[PDB]
């Protein structure tokens, strides 16, 4: 019966980390400035050259 007490809480923490990871991207394109819209594109282009 050790799934109701601590498993629910570490699962909540994992779900919350994923919630925050989404909320950190939700405000780049339309909430963020159009000048910083273009920031991540150079990472998306460099990743082709960054991996062995």
């Amino acid at each position: 019966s050790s799934l109701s007490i601590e498993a629910r809480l570490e699962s909540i923490e994992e779900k919350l980390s994923m919630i925050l990871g989404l909320l950190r991207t939700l405000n780049i394109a339309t909430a963020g400035p159009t000048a910083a819209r273009d920031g991540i594109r150079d990472a998306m282009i460099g990743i082709r050259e960054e991996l062995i």
Partner: protein
Amino acid sequence: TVNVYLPDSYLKGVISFSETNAIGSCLLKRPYLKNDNTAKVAIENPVIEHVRLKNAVNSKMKISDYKVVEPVNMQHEIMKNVHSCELTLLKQFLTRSKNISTLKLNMICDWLQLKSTSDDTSILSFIDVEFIPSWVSNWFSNWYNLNKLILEFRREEVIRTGSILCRSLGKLVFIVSSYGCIVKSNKSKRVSFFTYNQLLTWKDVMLSRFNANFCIWVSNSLNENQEGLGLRSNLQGMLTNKLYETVDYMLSLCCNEGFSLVKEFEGFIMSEILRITEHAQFSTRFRNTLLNGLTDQLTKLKNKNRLRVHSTVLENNDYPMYEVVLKLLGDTLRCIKLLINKNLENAAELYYIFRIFGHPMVDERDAMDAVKLNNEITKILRLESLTELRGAFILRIIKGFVDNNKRWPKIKNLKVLSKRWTMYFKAKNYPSQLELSEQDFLELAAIQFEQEFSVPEKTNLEMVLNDKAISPPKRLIWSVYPKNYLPETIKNRYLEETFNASDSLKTRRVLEYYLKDNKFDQKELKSYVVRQEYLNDKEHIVSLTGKERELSVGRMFAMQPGKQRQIQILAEKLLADNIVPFFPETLTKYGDLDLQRIMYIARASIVTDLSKFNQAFRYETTAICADVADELHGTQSLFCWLHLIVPMTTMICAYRHAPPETKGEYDIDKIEEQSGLYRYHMGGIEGWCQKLWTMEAISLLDVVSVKTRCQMTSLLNGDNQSIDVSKPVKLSEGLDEVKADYRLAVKMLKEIRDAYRNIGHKLKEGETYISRDLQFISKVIQSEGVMHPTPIKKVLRVGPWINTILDDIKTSAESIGSLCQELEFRGESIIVSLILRNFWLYNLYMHESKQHPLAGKQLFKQLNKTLTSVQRFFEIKRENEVVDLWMNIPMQFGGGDPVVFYRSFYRRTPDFLTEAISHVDILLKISANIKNETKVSFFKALLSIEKNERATLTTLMRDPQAVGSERQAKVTSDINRTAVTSILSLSPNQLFSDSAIHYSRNEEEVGIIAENITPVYPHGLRVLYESLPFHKAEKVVNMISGTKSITNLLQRTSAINGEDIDRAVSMMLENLGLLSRILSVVVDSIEIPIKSNGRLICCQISRTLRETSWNNMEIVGVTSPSITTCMDVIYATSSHLKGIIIEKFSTDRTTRGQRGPKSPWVGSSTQEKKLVPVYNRQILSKQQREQLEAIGKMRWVYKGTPGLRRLLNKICLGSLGISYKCVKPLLPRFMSVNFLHRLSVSSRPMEFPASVPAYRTTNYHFDTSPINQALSERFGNEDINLVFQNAISCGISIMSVVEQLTGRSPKQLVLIPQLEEIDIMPPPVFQGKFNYKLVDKITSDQHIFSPDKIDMLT
């Protein structure tokens, strides 16, 4: 060396607008029907064609002295003029058709054991030819004259590449040209300019008119003297002629909007059906819903016209004032209500009126500008419902995987799920729909799947190669518009641009695009889609051609460049293979869902339209599920492309004539937004993501079903969504059913409308409506289980030269037979079908074959040569009946009769040859005009062969039921095989040249592989054909053959060549005279397999004929004892010597108009008893699954045979890349020793439906148990050739043709086999070693069409 610009004989296209505006503007020197850029350009730089027309009409009577009314206005002159009476010719054709049909009915009645009192009106004198009511003649003389004119045009235009034909016709002098035409009325002093489209559409109109009034005249003339012989419909010919004239007058008065107002006719008719079949609570609702919209369109009309006519030559004309148009609507709905005298078979048959009146003059850029306002809107959304959609989509996927695979679709992160969905993960099951309310979908939407599926690496050429127009690229676009319509700057920049790009990017045809390519690399799409090189595609454009369909003023067909269209086709294919299943509603529709299965719990239905649905979608609406599908399929963005790339690019509406109002700048992204362009199209194109939009239109019903607690189902017949709702009320004893169903329906409607409003669609009132039962499942009017037909929709356009790429009598007659037979399959009155068949086959053979545009009198000299051959053979005294004897003969024996005697009782069959043999046998037996010892010599003539020729087996592989030794009638596919291989060979595509030079070598090497086998199972050879890559290549060749211009693929001519002309002429010349070819010798030295019952056993003649055209290679399996000759009928009641018995459940004289207790009779072959693989089927493409099935079928058909294992190993090695012992567990293990009966495969039917609908089939119950004592005493317990599904379907067709002929249906009838005709098929023992090596080279050179090589999956 010699090109041809042969026009078409029927519409086969669309009526344009800008071509008519330019043809007006050129001659008037003033804008005609508009003032847009088209007018300016035409009047300024007029094109050669319209300049030659200007010169001709200037030499002819003056334009300036006539009132130039638009073409629509002259319908009431054209359909009311009179040309010298051709009723003598109508009567001649009708008498010949009557004689032929009397022969056919005698043939039927002979073996049906019918007879009469020697009365001259046996069946076929109710139609007193002298008493034609004259409402059909008024359309027939008009149509004969107009068709003669058009044929003269065709004949002179095959000769001259451009000609102006001026022809008088009563008070309507026409002038025709391939590109323009003019009509002048000397009675009314008015000219109309229009084009071939709108010239031959009044011809299709009058033809449909004639064959729709004639098909009901014959029906009522046979129903006034025998109720049941005719179609069940009572339509007044005078009243419907009044309807036609009235609506033609209203269409004349309202210039180009009476069509958009006639679109309401379908709604009206549906409302009348509802008034008949329901109570007021729905009929008055649909009626008041459509009447308001009709009145609104009617008021708006005037304003529309006066907007369109500004700055034109019709502002000095006037538009009909409201009350007269309302009186005309009143008269025509009075007519549509009097014709429908409370009858749901009259209302069903009436549907042809939509297409009757004629197609509208679709305007090119006005539908586009109308839908601009709908495409450009911002639409507020609700994130809750938006994610509930995703949850429902995920749920359908999960139910699909649980059902098919028994495992959970792999997920990236198993922490976005609650404990509920985790234990369900470990359970592998799916909560019943009483559960999964909102929060469950909301947390189901949080899942990210991994790559469970896989994209095929190689481009499936069978898929990409399909003849469709391809829009040019962005920079090279102006080539679609004439060189005179463009400025000099744009002209020069185009001329210089065209040399930077390769020859591929100039074509507007897919086949040319993929043949003339130099650098084509089958692996490209797997790089393109992944690297996302289309998200900003600057050479990207979307041309909206405005090709459309009946009775509406817009349907804009897209055209996209090749790079893009490979992506559209790829997404559609991948969906149809993987994501379309998991969804019963949408793939099951056409053939299983509606017919057999769909047929206080408050029950109700909705019929909501989804035709103008593609324009309401945004990325924020569609990507929600598109990304789920894309995560399963395994790439970043593949299904949302339609919303990612489109908004940047520009809509053109690139019709041949209409240009944009250019200023002298070449980039289209620069041009200011015109009427014909607009850049930002935020929405969705028509037909590009239809499957995914139907998937979200279904997945929202689940959301609504969980919000409520009803049981919803959906059926999507084509363009609409029809929903069925079932909800226990648990509140009764007051208002019993109708207010309950009504309140449920209204509540459901409000909920669905709110669900759609939360997404962005403004569902209208006049599109969606309500009813208790769904009455519109696939546009067939079912009521209380009886399916009221729509018989005359297909027989409207059965005139001569139909459905032909080139004018071929064989294919034309076959199309006539196939259309008209719907009046036997969907419709009753087989007598009507025989009459309306023979009438037109006569008009095709003996009146129209003379003036053939290509060969002239060659056809008629040939037909009169095989007519004299047959006469001298059968010793006929009168030539009036030798055409009858030649026209009651199948096509495969050079006689024109494309209704084989089996087609009239059971749709599908083995051994067409033997069915035709029995047909001609019973014909010659009943024909008591010839002398005997010639009806028996005909078969010796058939059997006297010149067999000592090549024993080529690819013929059998492509058509397992074929005869050879020049007996088979050559088709376009074989005759053009060597020409298309010759042309393919010289193609800058290395791959295609390399496969085509090798084509004839593989074709001559395949036969070898199973030459030295005994017995040759041709279906086994068909399996060996499908297992190899050659099949796809042969299919590609067959697809590029039937194009109407075969040897001008690599040349921009759009013209037919003299070589193809002569080839088609020689085909139709050496195909008709086949009867003389088989009647030229007669050998007497054959003991014929005669019987001692009075008839001939057709199976012992067909077998010997096949073996003798085959070299006595002992083909085992292909033949079936025909039901027509062996299984005789006798009518009786529950007392006989144990024959297969058919009993009726009712005691009504007729057996129509009812559904009985039973569930219908459709005959399932009971094929392929399957110990299916229980390994993953997902990661393998449909191509690979098909291949595996074929290899397993080889493993089953050939067992214990030498070399088979090495053959399969090489086949695998070449097709799939793997060996056969490492794919053995993946195959299906069949277990049976009767593969002959079992192995229903292509070119072998798996269903055996009768020639009656389901409601007629739901009133007969059959027993076949009594025949097993005969069968088991004469033959052993081993299997028998006869197919009892076909036998019983033919007995039910016997009961149908018998009830129809005589209005007293038998209470019971028993069918008895005569076992001298029926043989047995013991499972054979194949004795012979394959040739196997050759497969290696065959797959070395047909590898481009092979599936993708599995590197490591097992």
